[PDB]
Structures are given as C-alpha cells and as structure tokens.
Amino acid sequence: DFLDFEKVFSFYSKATKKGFSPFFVPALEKAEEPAGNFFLDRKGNLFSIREDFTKTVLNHRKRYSPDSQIKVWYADFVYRYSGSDLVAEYQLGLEKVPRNSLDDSLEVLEIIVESASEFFEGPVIVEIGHTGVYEDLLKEIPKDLHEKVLNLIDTKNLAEIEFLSHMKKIDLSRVEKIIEDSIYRRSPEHLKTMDLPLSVREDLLSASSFLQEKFPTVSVEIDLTLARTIEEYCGLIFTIYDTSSSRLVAAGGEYTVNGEKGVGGSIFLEGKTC
Amino acid sequence: MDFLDFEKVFSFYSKATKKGFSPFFVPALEKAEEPAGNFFLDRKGNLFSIREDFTKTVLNHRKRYSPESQIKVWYADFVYRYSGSDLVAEYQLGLEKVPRNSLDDSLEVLEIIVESASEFFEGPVIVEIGHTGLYEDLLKEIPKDLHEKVLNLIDTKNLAEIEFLSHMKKIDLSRVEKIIEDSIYRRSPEHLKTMDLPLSVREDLLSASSFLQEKFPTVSVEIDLTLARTIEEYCGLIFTIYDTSSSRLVAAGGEYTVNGEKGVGGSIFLEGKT
Amino acid sequence: MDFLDFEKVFSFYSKATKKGFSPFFVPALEKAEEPAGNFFLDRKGNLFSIREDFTKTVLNHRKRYSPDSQIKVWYADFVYRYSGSDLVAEYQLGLEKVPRNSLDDSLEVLEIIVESASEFFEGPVIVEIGHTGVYEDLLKEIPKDLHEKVLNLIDTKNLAEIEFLSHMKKIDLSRVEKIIEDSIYRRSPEHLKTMDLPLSVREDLLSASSFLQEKFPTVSVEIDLTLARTIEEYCGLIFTIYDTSSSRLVAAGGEYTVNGEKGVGGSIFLEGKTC
Amino acid sequence: MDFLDFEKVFSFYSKATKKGFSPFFVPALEKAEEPAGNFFLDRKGNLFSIREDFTKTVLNHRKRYSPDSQIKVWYADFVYRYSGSDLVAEYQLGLEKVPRNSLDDSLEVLEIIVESASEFFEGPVIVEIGHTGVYEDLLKEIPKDLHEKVLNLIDTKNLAEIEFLSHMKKIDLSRVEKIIEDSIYRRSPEHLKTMDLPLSVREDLLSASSFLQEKFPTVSVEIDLTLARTIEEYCGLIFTIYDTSSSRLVAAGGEYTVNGEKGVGGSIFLEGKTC
Amino acid sequence: MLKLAIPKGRLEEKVMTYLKKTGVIFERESSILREGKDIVCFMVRPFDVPTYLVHGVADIGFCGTDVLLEKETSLIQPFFIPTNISRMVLAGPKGRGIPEGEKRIATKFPNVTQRYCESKGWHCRIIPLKGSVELAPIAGLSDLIVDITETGRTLKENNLEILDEIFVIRTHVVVNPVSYRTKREEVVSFLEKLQEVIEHDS
Amino acid sequence: MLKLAIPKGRLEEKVMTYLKKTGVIFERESSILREGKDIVCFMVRPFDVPTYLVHGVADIGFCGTDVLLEKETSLIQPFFIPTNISRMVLAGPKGRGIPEGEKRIATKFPNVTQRYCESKGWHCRIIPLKGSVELAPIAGLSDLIVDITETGRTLKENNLEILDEIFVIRTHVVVNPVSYRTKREEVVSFLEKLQEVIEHD
Amino acid sequence: MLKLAIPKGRLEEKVMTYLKKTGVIFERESSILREGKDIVCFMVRPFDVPTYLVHGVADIGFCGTDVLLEKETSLIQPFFIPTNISRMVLAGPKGRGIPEGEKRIATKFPNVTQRYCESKGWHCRIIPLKGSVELAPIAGLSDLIVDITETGRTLKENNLEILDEIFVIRTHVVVNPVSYRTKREEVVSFLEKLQEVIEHDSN
Amino acid sequence: MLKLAIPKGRLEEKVMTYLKKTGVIFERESSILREGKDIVCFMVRPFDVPTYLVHGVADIGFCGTDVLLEKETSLIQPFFIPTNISRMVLAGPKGRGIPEGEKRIATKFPNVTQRYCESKGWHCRIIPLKGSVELAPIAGLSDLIVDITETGRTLKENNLEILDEIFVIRTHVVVNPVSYRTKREKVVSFLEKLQEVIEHD
Ligand SMILES: N[C@@H](Cc1c[nH]c[nH+]1)C(=O)O
Ligand SMILES: N[C@@H](Cc1c[nH]c[nH+]1)C(=O)O
Ligand SMILES: N[C@@H](Cc1c[nH]c[nH+]1)C(=O)O
Ligand SMILES: N[C@@H](Cc1c[nH]c[nH+]1)C(=O)O
Ligand SMILES: N[C@@H](Cc1c[nH]c[nH+]1)C(=O)O
Ligand SMILES: N[C@@H](Cc1c[nH]c[nH+]1)C(=O)O
Ligand SMILES: N[C@@H](Cc1c[nH]c[nH+]1)C(=O)O
Ligand SMILES: N[C@@H](Cc1c[nH]c[nH+]1)C(=O)O
C-alpha cells in the first residue's frame, strides 16, 4: 500500500504557491573524504547517504555561486541506522535560507502544520520551543554541571534536579519550573509567568499566536525542555504529533549554520514512534 | 538548485491514475546477501545493491508474493547506473503492469508513455518498435558458435562484416542482411506485410503500429528489428522513443517474462544527475 | 612490547635450510578478482584476500609459475582469522613440500616441526598422529545419509550417541565405537596391530610412529583416528602437537591432495597478537 | 617462488641484539576508529589501516602503555604503499629507539644501518647526512607568504627559480643559494666549519660525519642540507644511504620529536613486492 | 489504554505492588502478560525495557541507569523507584592495578564498557558474559571486569578491587516521549498516582 | 586439578548431586565458586559454558544442544545428562501460520535463527531478547519467535502454535579438546566416575 | 546538421579526401574546426572519437577496432574505411618468453591489456604510456608490451617478438545510434555517397 | 653512461641541438632510441618523461611544469630550458561565465584539473581528452576546459575567454634524485656543459 505518496502533490501545491522550488537529488552523494556513515564501491568511490535533508540542502548551496537565496521543497527517502540496520522513511520538507525575519519561519510552520493537519486524522499537537532559553537557565548555575542539568532537562528528570538542588546547594527552581510547565502549564498563556529574555518571549508569542489564529483545531503547546536540539538549531523549534496513530509526525526549527540563518521543517508520512 | 520539472511528474501522475495506475515508491538502496559486482559496502558491514532497473524492483518488492491479482503502478525516482567509474542517476517516470494478459496491456502502457513524450518534448518524436521474437527465427540455421557475433553485428548494423562473414564462412545470411537493410529503408509499418516474420511477431507489430499511428499521427512510428541487445532482458514487443529536437533517447520499454509470468513496462527519461 | 623470540625463528630456519627448504615471504594482502569469502575493500576499488592459510597461499604462488615447479619452502609470518567479528592473527612457523614423492617427504616435515616444538615449548609434548584414509573404509557398512553425522559423532567422540544410534537405527557401528574408545584408552602405537585398518593406512601410521618414537624419546607419540573434519581438507596422515605445559595445541600439519597433486605441510603456533 | 635473503635478516638481527634492540613483530593490518586516508573495510564493519610506516606503528603501539615505556627495538617486515592504484609492499629492516638520550643513540642507529648497507650492497655506498635545524634559521629573514614555496625549491635544488625570485621579490636569498650550491660542490664533511650554520646544527653534523668517516672508510659520507621534505617528519639529523652499484636509495632515517620527546630510527630497503 | 513494560527480577514485586496500591486489577494474570481493563503489563527482561519503549509498543517502563546507558536510550525519566544504591564499576584482582598490554575485560554491558574504553583511549578485548562476571579474573578469562556493585561483598569474596567508579545507578520510571504527548492526560494521572504511593513509604 | 564450568539454573542441582554421589567434597563454597581438593567448579550462566571451555579456562562443562549450536564451538561430547525432552521450535500466533515475504523473528538465540532462516531461503529480521520471547508477537515486535518448549504450556498460554521443530535438545557433558589430551588420565578417571553414577541411576 | 568527428593523424588525409570526393566544401577552417553550412568537422584525436559520438555531440566518426575496444563503446558500424592490416599484439624482448612473476606491461591501451591479463589469468602491473611504447622492455620500464603492429618492422628494429595476437584491427565509420534515427535522411545520404566514393577508388 | 628521457615534438630539436653542442656523439640512431658510447636517449612522449625518471630508468629528462604537476612527481630541477612563457588556464565560452553546480571540464590534464576543482570546492565532471581540447564547449562535450595557452590566438579563434590562471609554465631539466648522488660526477659534468651551452645562446 504505497498510496500515501499522493499527499505529495498536495504538498507540492502548498509549497509552490508560497515560492518553493522542487529540490531533488540522488540518495548517494560522492564525498571528497570519509565523514561518519559511508558507503564505498568496487570502483574506488566513497559515498555518503542522505541522512539529513537540511545538511544536504546547505551543502548544495556551497557548490553554487556566491550568496544564493534558496526557497525549496523536497520529498524523498532519508536513510538512518538503528543499531546496524539501514532504514529509510519518506519525508516532505521545506528549507529557507536566510530567514530574513520570523514570517519566513511562520510561512514554513504554516505549510508543514497545514499538511500534517490534512495528512493525519485525529488531534494534532504543535509543540513549540526555543533554543534561546538554556543560556538564560545555565548562567546562574556553575559552569561545570552545565552538561548535567541540560541532560536532566531533556529527560524531564525533575527528581534528580531536586537532588542536585540539595546535595550541591544550588537553587534550581526555574529549571524545575520549565520542567513542571512542560507538564502542567503547556498553554501559551503561561509564557507571561515564565522568566525569559524579551526576544525569546516575543518569538514564542508570535508563533503561538499565529498558529492559534490559523489552526483552531490543533493543540498549540509550549515545551522548553528539548535541550538536545541546542546544537542543531538556533531559535524557534517545533514538533508535531499525531494522537490517532500516537506518533511523531513532523519537526523543524530555526538554525544558524556558519553565519546566516535558515528555517526548515519536515514531515514523516507515518514513521517515528520515538 | 537541483531543480526538477515537477509539473511533468504531476502530469504523468494524472495520466497514469486516470487509468488505474497506482503509486510505487521504495528506497533506492537494498540489502544484499551475496556480492554482485555493483554492490556497496557500508561501515556497519551490510552489503547493498542500488536501484538499477525498476521492473526488477517492482517484481521482487511488493508483488503480494502469495495470492491476488494485477498490479498497476507508476513511479518517479532516480535509477542509478555506472558511466565508466562514475555513479550517475536518471530520474525516470515509468509504468509497470504485470500481468501482461494481452497486447492490450502493452498498448495501454505505450499510450501513456508516448502521450507523455509528445507533451514533454518539443520537436518531432520517433517511436521505434521492435519485437524480441524474430531472433530465434533468424539464427534458425546459422551454426551456434556464430550466434553471439551475428547478434552483435545485427546490433551495430554492421552489414559489411556480415557480408564478409557470409563469404568467409560460406553461409547464407541474406535473411539477417534484409533485416538490417529494412531497419534503414523500410521502417514504415506498411512494410510489415512484406516482411518475413513469424505470424505472432508480425501481428503484434501490426496491431501496435495501427493503434499508435491512429492515435498519434504527429509522432513517427517506425519499425526496427535490430536491437539484438534487448533479448537477455525483454521478451516480446519492445520500444524506444527519440526526441529529434534535443537528439536523445527519451524513453524505452517493452514486454518481459520473469519466470512463467509476463509483464510490460516503460520509462521516460527526464534528468541525468551527479 | 610485541616481542617475538626470534631466536626461535632463526633456529627453525636452520633446521629447515638444511633439509633444503627455502624461505617464502609474501605480503599479507593479495589482490583478488572476485568477492569470495573474507574480503577487504580498499579506498581505490581493489578487493583483497588476507592470508588465512599458508598452504593455500604457497599453492597459489606455485600456479603463477607455469612450467610447474617442485616447491620446498619454509615460512614465518602472521596467519589471520576471525574470532567472531574481530580479525586476529597468529604468528606461524611452517613448511610445505609439493610434491610429496614418498612418506619419507612427510617424515622430514614431521621431523622438523616436532624437533622445533620440543625445543620451543617447555612442556613434555604430545604428537598425536592420525590418518584420513580410515573413514571410507569405516563409512560403507553404514547407510548413506547416516554418514555426515556419524562423522560428526566420531569428531566429537560422542560414544553415547553412537551406542544409541546402534539401536534406534538398527545397524552395527561396533568398529566405529572401537576407533573412538581406542583414541581414549589405547593411543600407544603399539596397539596399531590390534587395530582393524586398511593396509596402506596401517603401514603409514606404523612408519610415522616408529620414526618419531626412535628419534624423539622424550615426546609421547600417540595415535588418534577421530577428527573426521580433517577429511575435506587433508588426504593421508595428519598430525597435531600439544604442550602439556602451556596446555595448548602447538603445531598441526599433514598430507593433502590438490588436483592429482600430493603435498605435505606443517605449521607451528608461537602465536598471539590482535589485529 | 618468493625467496628472501634471510641470511641478511639474521645478520641484521645479530647486529641489533648485540646493541640491545628487541624484536618487534605485529600484524600488517590494525584497527582504526575513525577513517584516516588509506583504509580497508571488511564484510564485518571493521575499518583498518595498513602498515605504511614502521616508526609510526612502533609509536602508535608504544602509546598503549601507562608510564610510557623505554623502547629499543628492531623490526623486519613488509611496509605497504600505493603506486598508482595498486598496493605494493617493501620488506624493511629497521630500528627504533625512543627516548633519544643524546647523539650517541642516534649514531648507534647509524652504525647498524650503515654497516648493514655496506655488507648488503655491492657498489660504493653513499651515506648522505643532513639536519632539520638548518631551516628555521634560513627562513627567519624571508617573508612568511613564500616559505613553503622556497622550501620546495630548495628540495628540488631549483637554483634558477630561487634566483628568479631573488629578482621578482627583491630579497636576499643568498644564503638559500649557498646551501643548494654546497649540496653539489661542497658535500665533503671538511666544509662544515665554513658552512654558515647554527652552531648546534654544525656540532651534530661534525660529529656524525667524523664517527662515520673514521668507522667506515669505504663509504662515502656526504652532507646535503637540502631535503626540506624531511622538515615535518624529522627533527634533528637525518640520513639516506645509496648504493651506486644498483642505482637505488637503500636506507633512510633520522631523529624525530614524539609529542614530548626525542626518538631515533632508520630502516633498510631490502626487497620489493606486489600487494 | 496504557501499556507498561515491567522488568522481571529483583524489582518485579516492588513495581507490581506499587501498581496494586494504585487501583490496578488485571483479570488475566499470566506469568509474562498481565492484561487489565485500562492497563496491560508486559513482564519483560530488564535489558529489553528500552526496546519496548522506543518502538512505542509500551508507553511506560522501569529501568536502571545501567540498561538505559547500555542501550543509548534517550527517553523521559521523571522520578525514581526507591532502591538501594548501586554502581557500575571497573574492577580487577587485588593489588594488580590496570594491566598495560591490551586490557582484557568481561561484562554483561559490552556497550557501556566499549565506550568506557574509548573514553580512556584503551585497546581492549571485550568478553561478553551473562552473569558470574566476577569469575572472569579468577579463571583467567579476563584481566578485568566492569560490573554492578552495591555493598561490595561479592567483590571482596573474589579478591577484586574497585579500580574506578564509572557511574552510579538508580531505577527510573521511563516514558516514551510521544505517548507523553499523545496520551498526556492518561500518563500524568497514572504517574501522579504511582508517585503518591512511593511517597506513602516515607 | 581439573576445573568444571557448571551451568546455573535447572541443571545446577542435577549435576552437583551427581558430583556429590561421585564422592566430591567441596571445602570452600561461594555463590559462584565451588572449590575442593582436586576440583574447582565455576558456577556460570549456561550460554557461557562454551566460552569457559573453548578458552582453555575450564576442562569440563555441561550444556544443552541450544547453547552448543548458538556458539559455533568445537568440543568433545562423551555422554549426556538425562533430562526431560525439550526442543527449539519456530512459532507464531495461533491459526495465522507463516505470513511470509518479509519475516521478523524474536529470539534469545540469534545465531540459531540466522542459520535457520538461511537454510530455508528466507529473508528475515532477527530481534534479540533476553527472555519473555513468547510476548513479542502480541506486542508490535515480531511476527514469529524461535524458543524452547517442553510442556507446550507457554506457547498455548500465549496463543502460539509450533510451526516447525528445528531440533531436539539434550544436555551434554563437554570437554576441552586440548585438555582431553594434555590431562587425559585425570579427565578419563573423573569422567568414568560420573558416567558410572549417572548410568547407575 | 551533420557533425563529423575526424581522427587527426594517419587517417586524416584519406578521410578528408573522401569528404572532398563527396561534395563537401568547407568555407571556414582552422587546425581544429572545419565547418561549411550542412557539415561540420571536429578535428580530434583518434582516441576521443567514441567520446564525441557516444555523448551524441557528433553524429559520425572514423575509428579503429583498437579505440572501440579501448572505450567499451558500442555504436553503429555500417562499413569499413579500407586501410592496411594491423594487429593489436603482445610482445617482449626477442626469444626471452613470458616472465613468471607479476608481469610489467607498458601500453597506450590500458583497458585492452587489463582485459587481456584477466582472460589469461594473469597478475600484472600496467604502465600507461602515450607512445614510444617499444622502449620500455629496453629501458626496463616493463617486461612486456601490448601495442599495434602492421608489418613487424618496428618490433624487430627494436628486438621484440610477437608473443600473442590479441585481435586484428580494421577502420570503421561509426554513427551515433540516436542521431541515426533523429537525422536519418541526412545520415543515410552521407553514408550512401561516402560508400560510393570508396568503391570508385575500388575498395 | 647517462640515460636521458627526451620529449618528442615541440622541444625535440631544441634539446637534441643542445646535446650536439655538448660533444654528444651517437653511433646508433632510431626514431625512438639514440645510442652513444656514454649517453643514450629515449625519445619518449612529454607526459612520459617523469615516469622514466621516477623508476630510475633514465637519469635526466626535460619536461614542463604541466607534466611535472600532472604526475605528482618530485624530482630535482636545477635550471630551465628557455622557452616562450605559457600558462595553464581555465577557459570557457566568451561571456558565458561559470555554470553553477555541475561543471563539465574537458582537459588533457585530469589530475591538475581535479586538484584545481578541489581547491575551489567545485563539483565538476572531468572529461579526459588527448588534444583539440578547445572544441568541447562548442560540441557541448564540456562547459569549460583547463588547457595551456601562450599567445591566446588559439582560444580567441574558438571564442573562449580565460577564466583563471592556474600556474605559469616553464620547461626544466630534471634529474632522478638518486642518480644525482649515485653518479653525480657525470650528471654534474653533463649539466655544467648543458648550462654553458644555454648561456651562450
Ligand atoms: N542518568 C541516568 C539515570 C541516572 C543518573 N544517575 C542516577 N540515575 C540516565 O541516563 O537515565
Ligand atoms: N511534577 C512531577 C512530575 C510528574 C508529572 N506527572 C507525574 N509526575 C514531579 O514532582 O516530579
Ligand atoms: N548427539 C546429537 C544429538 C544432540 C545434539 N545436541 C544434543 N544432542 C548431536 O550431535 O546433535
Ligand atoms: N571423550 C570420551 C569420554 C569418555 C569417558 N569414558 C568413556 N568415554 C568419549 O566420549 O568417548
Ligand atoms: N567491435 C567491432 C570491431 C571489429 C571487428 N572486426 C573489425 N573491427 C566488431 O566486432 O565489429
Ligand atoms: N548500416 C548500413 C549503412 C548504410 C549503407 N548504405 C547506406 N547506409 C549498411 O551498411 O547497410
Ligand atoms: N616545477 C616548478 C615549475 C615552475 C615554477 N614556476 C614556474 N614554473 C614549480 O612549480 O615549482
Ligand atoms: N644538479 C645541479 C647541477 C648544476 C648546477 N649548476 C651547474 N650544475 C643543479 O642543477 O643545480
């Protein structure tokens, strides 16, 4: 039952009406030198496989002439390992580079959320985060230990935060608060009561607002615990889940690779129990 | 930036689904167990095969192994091949219809592909028809140790070498000679009656010829029985399409038998890459 | 730090280049044309085999020479293998004579490997002799597809499954039982006359046992006709050497045929090393 | 069949063990964590490097030791390299000593190699010595932008491109030219007191020359300060030996800097093979 | 519903007793599957807990730091199940120190020890075992072990010394991160109820 | 002095009791070591008996056919310990039989299921588990399992059907092949005592 | 329109003269390019002829069997250009036979000799050269060579013996298969006239 | 004896005439090999000079920067053969710039251009040719070429403009680095004469 792959033409329509050009590359890509996961062949070629669409897009940007503005959409397999098994999953995605504003990222969110909303039946949840916290959190916390708290935040291990709180004698109350709010106060209105830098509040307010106004039937939730995404993203961060099938249906965010900014997102037709 | 004329894929989709062709998308890479020349070795130890032919993929892959019917399908994706020691990829659009119950199934595939060709290419289109049949027939009386080279000779239209062969081997190859000559001077279907072929071969060529010429008076349907090359891969009617405008081979396919089965497919070529 | 008693290598080289064996040193890696078995792929497209069997190696290099040549070599290098999924290597000393013209040729090999082993290892050493010509004679009396199983049982000295096979599938395997039981209780060469054995097999065992016993009065020469898995790889007499001190297998060799071609060879393991 | 003058390995072995080197033998293929140029993949996921340089192998093996180890070792094995897209292998005899306590250690190394070469090779042997310390000095007064270019010119003895640069840039190359000109006309060690050298660099060459020249009357001891190529493999004095009879580079080594310390080594090129 | 992946072994009774004090009834109590009205319990082996969570075949599970780290598992671990303190340690025969040659090590945790070796930049042969790992040194099967310790009785019996403390172990309730959002209401109710009962036991 | 790798679990008691009947006295005992004059007993998990034997670190051991076939291991198998019949079996949910094409199989015995799939012309995804293997089809994880049965209790209690007997399991005493020659008078004299006590029962 | 890939060197004059005898008038010329509204000639090296045809950047070329076999290139071959007999051969120094180790082989034809060495089950180092191949056994660059021979004059003037005849070589006119169809009326007219011209010199 | 690898073609008369002026007497001569009792030269192709010098089958040779760089050969180069200055350049159709992404580049100089592409982070498909490189842009075999130029009339004739200098070219005398130590009395005598001749010109 390949038939889900029709949603691609729908996605293609959304993205072209918004200025997105189709981006299509082979799954294998020749590599100057070995860089992690690779395949070699009997002819002395070394290849990398598509593991990350946005890395692939940025890397093709380097091939092209100076500057190069880029507003593309893709639809293809992304390969990954689980243990030592090569695994593929189809993805529909967007990429814009630079993000000139917030409206660019919001255009990106609009297209991906509108898609998820059509492609999956059953309550959809839009979880929004922001890399720009963390730096606020850690800078009342001793430098060594930063790796630890960040971990505990990602895992939502309130318990062990209370333990470090007592055994090392530092008040971690706002860390405890972010974790707590990610459980009990996920409504955007609780941003008011959260201690964050003006620009993080703002981005969060206008993303939560824009999504709310546009999508009355999707649950727009805030969760600032996704600390692992700290060094792949820089700014707004989002994730979509499908309740009906209980799975992770989409992800993306703002990013900043070697100067200059971008946003991108991706949808996984099915995939992701984790 | 790795643009792909995606309207064409849409248009091909609209033409295929209008006739009950369903989608078919699978990862390009595949797990192999035994090393088969064109393999890839990964850092994990797995050994892979890369998609080189869609009809093989369509057969192995899904085909509901155990009981139950007909599979139509269209696909759009990279097919990979080696040019010398380089890996290159063709983005193909194609159709597979297995089982091949009758010439009707072949004319339905041809109708879609040829319709897509005259729409996508902007300059007189040539639809060349052949039949894998008439080979066992010539060769009939040529000694077995000469079959290989006579087939290559017919493949490359080396009329001079054949006439030299004929004389040096004191063998009548006039029947082979006439076929090469016809492939040059008697390519109009209106010669099929004048041609020495087995009945079932001529009838297939006539019916396909009548229909194509009636439905696509703008294309030029021509008969060419050389192309010995397609026997170790096709079984029955065969076709190729040429765009006189850009001077390329723009499509090919035909009937095949993969053990007791029988199918037809075909592929439009729109993009070389990498 | 990756130390070798190279005195042992020089010594072995003296023993060999006196019997007319000549040195044979080749690269561990060798370019292959087809992805057979354990291969190695290279950043240039090359496939390689890695030296897994010295006789297999010496034998390919003979075939590169196509007027056809009497090879009498000794070697000293790593032989590589897999332990689950890690490549390990054993440092080996060995001989190879192709063609074997007589038992006297096999005895010369034995004499160097045994003498080498009794001087390289502390322990009172055991030379266990076998012969591959025992199995054919043993097998038919016994049903066809009960063969490659009663071989596994011989190999495994599964005397209990044999006695049970002797009843559940009505057949006499009493001479199978005797071979096993001998290999436990009467391994002394002296018992070779007690044994029901094809004539040529018995002459070969008797002359080897004798030869070794007379020349090496401080090694225990014993006779053991199990280890049927040497069948698809050896052809004629077979030997293994154990050190009771290290409690390890220390040497192994034997007669073999490669396409109407008789040779003998023997290896010693000083061994070690992880790749 | 793949003969090797083992009488020469044994000779080398005696020479080395008399001076206290221990044997160093390890497999040709080692595990690697991450990819580093030439590498090999097996059907098991393992990634391997191949022995491309003994001293690098000796060191990346000595690092597996907590207190660090005092290492004094001779080898004797194949070293691998690509010639085109083909794997080739050369059998090398070498020495490696880390720490280098003084010059006496380096000279000890030069004594064995040089003596092995004078015995292993017919035609007059040339032992050409240099020093890495000479280049700091040289480059001190020349722009940074054209350091790498000048060092290549001096390594190629391209006296003409130097002079052309003396004129297109307007620098005193002067000193670089002397060094090239000297490496053709004033190779004799007697000219070392007239060479405009850092006093330390002069002391080491003076002393290595003497020692060699006194102990080796039939060899031609020569000094060549070009060989900028060695500038980041070695740190101190270097040497190369040539055999005039055949016409080849037969031995090479020198002093090097190993993270914290000093070590010396050298090797002899005694036989080339394929794969 | 809510599918739980309970580890068989030392914790089984503890966890299952917490579940009972929570209002859970099963009506299918099999040795390996406790199926209930609004909760099903897979009685799986501890190493396997993570497998069940990451494929989403369970929503909640109970794990030690040791299996989580050994499995590269990346979930949500809100609070612990009380448990005596244990530790993952490197250990070897008394007064032998770390052998420098190629360090031979046995574990039930090849992964954890394969990483430990990388971090110390060692070259080591990992001998995987299923239990009785403290024998390896005594028997000559390894020069070293990496295994769990609590009191250090087993270690002093087998004349082993702690040569290093790698990490300390605690038993976590763990949650698959998607069902924490998809079945959020269910999860949070059950997790509050669970946590309230652990709390009764001061 | 010979060393024995004895397997912890439903075998420990049987083998230990036989040893006691042989007249073995232990002197020093831990949960893991049994050490008497002339004999030491390494108390180990059943899968690791081959690894204690293969490595020359124990002279004698006791395994079932399952552990022996899951480790490619090479060793002498003189006689067996009498044991209630059990077999390795391929299984899957009741009725539904063998849904093929792509086959996913959960086991405690990866090696045994590999070798099994191959010798069936099968393309299959092995899921290793440490136990509760019978549970995988109910959950999302596999379509089939391979595991050990004796009563049929467990399979029918979880609505699973034997789909193929792979092999009957018996437990063997096994000897280090080397130490069979290097210590044979002591190995044979011990093994003779053991054999006579089991035979007598 | 018709693009011809013409092989510079030995065949140039013969072909160009065939072209003239056919009606071709150029009106525009250089070392490299000869045009003439209806016809273009690319003056290329013989080795590159298939690479021009195979990519369909020229429609008709002229080639020896040697370059066709060197580039695993298959394209339509209607008739031959008549020339003197030549053979691709194996050769080594006079009466010294085949060396028994890893054989060193020099050649302009690395792909042909790689295939020869396999088919003969051989271990060989291939040293590519661009010419003067008959040195190399003399110089010590190689044990053997694979080269072209016609008489044997060059082989013997340098003390070499033929040791194996690999294949005999003829000169083909070749056509780019797709343009055989896209521009067939033109191709056939040209080939028809060209074949007439080769039967009025009488070959 | 000294063996020289002499480049056939453009430089062939220039060098041979320099040799004449040094007293070099050949007794045997052939299109391909020229032998004197003390000096023999191999008349080989210019690209093949370095491969005669690397294997030490010749002691001295004469070749350009282009060949020296195209084979990554490092041998000694004492002084030059006087010649008109030329440069390896990148060229393409006039005005047509540089295509983004996949650059097809035709050249007789595969390595140099492969290296050049690496240096500018280019993805480029390289089409090796044996000559008449300036075709290909027209023809559409390539978008771009990497070729040698001096006067520029060849590129101008074919409507190509230069897009980048890669390196300036000179021709050198080159010496096998071992032959120089190993028979230096002779190499140095010969080079000295060789230089004296060139200076007089
Ligand atoms: N940190 C462990 C749990 C833990 C840490 N400390 C105690 N327990 C984990 O990754 O789940
Ligand atoms: N806030 C809870 C975490 C939790 C949410 N749901 C259940 N537990 C605590 O005190 O740790
Ligand atoms: N002894 C037979 C039966 C068996 C195997 N394992 C246990 N019993 C065998 O070789 O397999
Ligand atoms: N390996 C011997 C062991 C034995 C003891 N007693 C009798 N047999 C065998 O089974 O025959
Ligand atoms: N491939 C060509 C080459 C040839 C053969 N004979 C002359 N030329 C053919 O076989 O027709
Ligand atoms: N392949 C054809 C080409 C041709 C001949 N005449 C005109 N065109 C043949 O030789 O018959
Ligand atoms: N081989 C010389 C060629 C050269 C330099 N400058 C001009 N030409 C070099 O690159 O150094
Ligand atoms: N090989 C020296 C020879 C020489 C220099 N000057 C005169 N002769 C060089 O070319 O630099």
PDB file of N, CA and C in Angstrom, chain D residues 81 83-84 86 88 274-275, chain G residues 101-103 123-126:
ATOM      1  N   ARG D  81      52.328   0.479   0.512  1.00  0.00           N
ATOM      2  CA  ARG D  81      52.138   1.814  -0.065  1.00  0.00           C
ATOM      3  C   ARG D  81      51.421   1.667  -1.384  1.00  0.00           C
ATOM      4  N   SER D  83      51.285   2.522  -5.399  1.00  0.00           N
ATOM      5  CA  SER D  83      51.993   3.035  -6.537  1.00  0.00           C
ATOM      6  C   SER D  83      50.955   3.024  -7.609  1.00  0.00           C
ATOM      7  N   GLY D  84      50.407   4.208  -7.877  1.00  0.00           N
ATOM      8  CA  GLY D  84      49.213   4.355  -8.686  1.00  0.00           C
ATOM      9  C   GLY D  84      48.030   3.966  -7.823  1.00  0.00           C
ATOM     10  N   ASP D  86      47.656   0.697  -7.176  1.00  0.00           N
ATOM     11  CA  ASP D  86      47.999  -0.664  -6.792  1.00  0.00           C
ATOM     12  C   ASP D  86      48.727  -0.744  -5.471  1.00  0.00           C
ATOM     13  N   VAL D  88      51.430  -2.041  -3.118  1.00  0.00           N
ATOM     14  CA  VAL D  88      52.742  -2.672  -3.184  1.00  0.00           C
ATOM     15  C   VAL D  88      53.297  -2.715  -1.770  1.00  0.00           C
ATOM     16  N   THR D 274      54.511  -7.147  -4.528  1.00  0.00           N
ATOM     17  CA  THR D 274      53.242  -6.619  -5.000  1.00  0.00           C
ATOM     18  C   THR D 274      52.092  -7.037  -4.091  1.00  0.00           C
ATOM     19  N   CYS D 275      51.172  -6.092  -3.882  1.00  0.00           N
ATOM     20  CA  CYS D 275      50.036  -6.208  -2.968  1.00  0.00           C
ATOM     21  C   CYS D 275      50.393  -5.682  -1.584  1.00  0.00           C
TER      22      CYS D 275
ATOM     23  N   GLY G 101      56.639 -14.023 -12.814  1.00  0.00           N
ATOM     24  CA  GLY G 101      56.055 -13.249 -11.735  1.00  0.00           C
ATOM     25  C   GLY G 101      55.130 -12.168 -12.258  1.00  0.00           C
ATOM     26  N   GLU G 102      54.529 -11.426 -11.335  1.00  0.00           N
ATOM     27  CA  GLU G 102      53.864 -10.166 -11.634  1.00  0.00           C
ATOM     28  C   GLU G 102      54.503  -9.521 -12.874  1.00  0.00           C
ATOM     29  N   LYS G 103      53.859  -9.677 -14.031  1.00  0.00           N
ATOM     30  CA  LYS G 103      54.396  -9.153 -15.298  1.00  0.00           C
ATOM     31  C   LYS G 103      54.127  -7.652 -15.442  1.00  0.00           C
ATOM     32  N   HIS G 123      48.658 -11.932 -13.270  1.00  0.00           N
ATOM     33  CA  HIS G 123      48.958 -10.871 -12.308  1.00  0.00           C
ATOM     34  C   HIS G 123      49.876  -9.856 -12.962  1.00  0.00           C
ATOM     35  N   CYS G 124      49.361  -8.669 -13.273  1.00  0.00           N
ATOM     36  CA  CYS G 124      50.185  -7.679 -13.992  1.00  0.00           C
ATOM     37  C   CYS G 124      50.025  -6.213 -13.584  1.00  0.00           C
ATOM     38  N   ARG G 125      51.167  -5.528 -13.580  1.00  0.00           N
ATOM     39  CA  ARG G 125      51.260  -4.087 -13.361  1.00  0.00           C
ATOM     40  C   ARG G 125      51.144  -3.428 -14.733  1.00  0.00           C
ATOM     41  N   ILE G 126      50.210  -2.501 -14.878  1.00  0.00           N
ATOM     42  CA  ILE G 126      50.073  -1.790 -16.155  1.00  0.00           C
ATOM     43  C   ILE G 126      50.628  -0.358 -16.082  1.00  0.00           C
TER      44      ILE G 126
END
